Every structure is written in structure tokens, then in C-alpha cells.
Design a protein around this ligand. Structure first.
Ligand SMILES: O=C(COc1ccccc1P(=O)(O)O)NC1CCCCC1
Ligand SMILES: O=C(COc1ccccc1P(=O)(O)O)NC1CCCCC1
Ligand SMILES: [Cl-]
Ligand SMILES: [Cl-]
Ligand SMILES: [Cl-]
Ligand SMILES: [Cl-]
Ligand SMILES: [Mg+2]
Ligand SMILES: [Mg+2]
Ligand SMILES: [Mg+2]
Ligand SMILES: [Mg+2]
Lengths: 228, 228
């Protein structure tokens, strides 16, 4: 449905929809921009990420409320409506995974872009894993694992330890370990190594870079405090 | 699309969607419940009101952001996207007005229901008036006026001055006068008379009724403070 709108108009309207807190419209404008087939700039990558994080964040928070109600219940209404929200959540994750696979990841040759999109692929399989059950759940967990691992390998080879994309990848992969993979020690180890390596690289940064890096380091510290 | 769901299941799912902060789903479930054709209980009236107030509240807040950006601008994108949001806002107001007219108002014989639905009819024409221009704007303002006035006449004949529905009607009609009709003195007069008449009736109330009434009296006082 965004096929008739210019790419630059879609980007401009995504920024307006962000100002208006209309994140479903923001996601649909960024989906249309990706579908134009050109690579995304750094600014455009971040618009894409912000739009879908907020859309899925609404759905995950709802699914959590409904799942809690359902667990306490244990008529069909609670389960039906939890299933409705779950399906729409899965559809959002599938849409994002579809954009990554057609064809954002394959055309991303620079480290900053390739790590960004692989971390997104890990995050959206992780959201699928949160609602999954059984050994359907297993292949989804492994897919999230694989994406984060490929991003980590690239990030370690190609980015400094203070790069905010590298930091946020490590933060989300530590949450995957803690929340999804039942590997709290791996979680803690990753978050502590990441924090310590970044601290030792801070001296290299300008004032503005320092503020960007240390903000994500504080998120790593807040988790280690929650986890230990 | 809610035609196949039982009325009681629609009400139960509206309450769940409220807990999950999913107000578009809440509105669609309550729309489906009204469309069953039976009168609404007091609790159900309030579910209907909460669902649509939140949906339209999102849209009005967005429209305000975009209108402000557009005014400062004065390409087509800002205007196009403001128009997109405006159209969806108008469609929500038309849907609510449609439910009131088919056939909630005509079947509402008790004062508490009839005043509730007429105040809703005033509020949703008032939201239409906020985005309207010219002398299209005039007939819409007059429609909001007419609905509030009919509700006020009934409320004064049939409800005590502390009844919370009567208070909230007077509060919203005073906002209509101040914001839409360019009649700040009428606004102030209404809000002060309403506050004073309720204060003199408080002695008749139980503890719980007193808390309900005085909460809306504080909203009247907060406006008089803003307006004087
Ligand atoms: O409270 C959190 C914290 O989650 C994270 C913390 C650190 C890194 C990544 C995440 P997320 O699980 O949101 O990707 N997330 C909420 C989960 C419910 C939906 C809104 C966001
Ligand atoms: O800040 C207000 C105060 O508006 C009122 C105050 C008293 C009575 C009725 C209203 P409203 O105009 O929301 O019906 N309203 C916001 C207007 C922007 C959209 C969300 C609500
Ligand atoms: Cl449902
Ligand atoms: Cl490539
Ligand atoms: Cl548009
Ligand atoms: Cl009647
Ligand atoms: Mg073009
Ligand atoms: Mg390339
Ligand atoms: Mg039935
Ligand atoms: Mg009747």
C-alpha cells in the first residue's frame, strides 16, 4: 500500500509519525521505505528499529497481561483473546523478519549495518520465542541464538568495544541468555565482560561518544544488579 | 465482524482489552456489543465511553502535534499526513455518532442513560468541531450545542446536582463553551454555578458518593483556575 509514495516522503512521514507517537503508522511508512529496495542509511535504520520496537512492545505488554490472567484462570474468552494478541504479535515479528530476509541482510556489507540487522533478526526471533511452546520453541530459540552469535562475531572483529551498536547487541544477547535460554551464568558473564571491555576503551572517546556508550553501559550494570 | 461473538463474550473481552491497554480492540468489542441491539447497562455504558475516549484521545493528540508542525511550515507531506490522521479521527467520531443514533439514544428512557448518551453525542460532535473549518464548522458546533443542551435540560430536571454524570456533562459543556464556541464567560458561569450547586448538596451523600462527586468538582475548579 506504500508503493505509490516516494521514498523520501515515506521517511519524512515516518519522522512525523514518531513525533505524533503513531508507531503503527511509523512502521508502515518504514516498511514501505525498505520495500523500495535501496539500502537504508544509519538514520533510516534507527527509524525502522524504533517503529517496530514500539509496535511490538505494545503487543508484548498486552500479551503479558492476558497470559497472567489466563494462568490464574487455570469460558474460552481469555484464551481466545490472548491467542488473538499472540497472532498479531507473531505477524509483526514475521513482517520484520521478512524485511531482514528480503533483502536487508544480504545487501548489508558494512559492519555497522550488518550487525544492526542481525541483532534485529535475533530480537524478533526472541519475541517469537517468548510466546512459543514445545520443540517449535526450540528451533525458534536456535534461530535467535544464531543471529545474535553471527552479529557478535562480526562486532568483535570490526567494532570497538564501546560502539553503541556492539554494546546494545551484547545487552540483548545477555537478556536472551537470561530470559529465553535459561543460561543466567552465560548472561552474567557476557554482560560483565562487555561492561569491563567498554570501560577500558572509554578514554578514547569524545564527550558525546562517551555519553552514548556510558548510557548503554548503565543498562548492562542495571541488569547485573537485577541478576546478581 | 463481531456478529458471530456472544454479547457476554464481547463484554468480557472489552474488560480484558481495557486491562491490556488495547483500546482499539476494546472499542471494537463494545461496538459489537451495542450492535446486538439490546440496551446497555451502566457498567457497559462506561466501557463504551472509556474505549472510544482513549481511541479518539490518541488521534486528537496526534492531530495536535501534526497541526502545530503544519502551522509552523506556513512539500505536501505534513498536510497529507495531518489529513490522514484527521480522516481517521472523523471516522471514529462518525462511528460513535452512528451507534448513538442507531439506536442507543432513541431507546434510552431513563435519565441516567439518556443524559449519558446525549453528553457523548455532544463530545463527539465537539471533536469533529475541533478539526472542522468554515461554515461546515458552524452546523457541527450547533449539533454539539444541541446535544449538550438537551442533556443539561434533562439532568437539571431529573438528577441531583451532585450526580457525577450531571457534573461531567456540565464540565464538558463548559469546555465546549470555552474551546469551541468562543464563549469564555458562559464557560466560567456554567462551571461556577455547577460547582456551587454541587457543594451545597454534598451533605446528602455517603462517603463513597462524596468521593465520586468531589473528584469531578475538582476538575471544575481546575478549569476555573485555568480560565480566571
Ligand atoms: O522491560 C523490558 C526490558 O527489556 C529489555 C531490556 C534490555 C534489553 C532488551 C530488552 P527487550 O526485551 O524489550 O528487547 N522490556 C519490556 C518488555 C514488555 C514490552 C515492553 C518492553
Ligand atoms: O487535556 C485535555 C483536557 O480535556 C478535557 C478537560 C475536561 C473535560 C473534557 C475534556 P476533553 O476535551 O478531553 O473531552 N484533553 C486532551 C486533549 C488531547 C487528547 C487527549 C485529551
Ligand atoms: Cl478474541
Ligand atoms: Cl553484501
Ligand atoms: Cl499520509
Ligand atoms: Cl424511550
Ligand atoms: Mg522515486
Ligand atoms: Mg551493500
Ligand atoms: Mg446470544
Ligand atoms: Mg428503554
Amino acid at each position: 500500500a506504500m508503493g505509490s509514495m516516494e521514498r523520501a516522503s515515506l521517511i519524512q512521514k515516518a519522522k512525523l509519525a514518531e513525533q505524533a507517537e503513531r508507531y503503527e503508522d511509523m512502521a508502515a511508512f518504514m516498511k514501505g521505505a525498505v520495500e523500495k529496495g535501496e539500502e537504508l542509511s544509519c538514520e533510516e535504520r534507527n527509524l525502522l528499529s524504533v517503529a517496530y520496537k514500539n509496535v511490538v512492545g505494545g503487543q508484548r505488554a498486552a500479551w503479558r497481561v492476558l497470559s497472567s490472567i489466563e494462568q490464574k484462570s487455570n469460558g474460552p474468552e481469555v484464551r481466545e483473546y490472548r491467542e488473538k494478541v499472540e497472532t498479531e504479535l507473531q505477524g509483526v515479528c514475521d513482517t520484520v523478519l521478512g524485511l531482514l530476509d528480503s533483502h536487508l541482510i544480504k545487501e548489508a556489507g558494512d559492519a555497522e549495518s550488518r550487525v544492526f540487522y542481525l541483532k534485529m533478526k535475533g530480537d524478533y526471533y526472541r519475541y517469537l520465542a517468548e510466546v512459543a511452546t514445545g520443540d517449535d520453541k526450540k528451533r525458534i530459540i536456535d534461530s535467535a541464538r544464531s543471529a545474535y552469535q553471527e552479529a557478535m562475531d562480526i562486532s568483535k572483529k570490526e567494532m570497538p568495544p564501546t560502539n553503541p551498536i556492539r554494546l546494545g547487541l551484547a545487552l540483548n544477547f545477555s537478556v536472551f541468555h537470561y530470559e529465553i535460554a535459561n543460561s543466567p551464568e552465560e548472561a552474567i558473564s557476557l554482560a560483565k565482560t562487555t561492561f569491563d571491555e567498554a570501560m577500558a576503551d572509554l578514554h578514547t572517546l569524545s564527550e558525546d561518544s562517551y555519553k552514548d556508550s556510558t548510557l548503554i553501559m548503565q543498562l548492562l550494570r542495571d541488569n547485573l544488579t537485577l541478576w546478581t
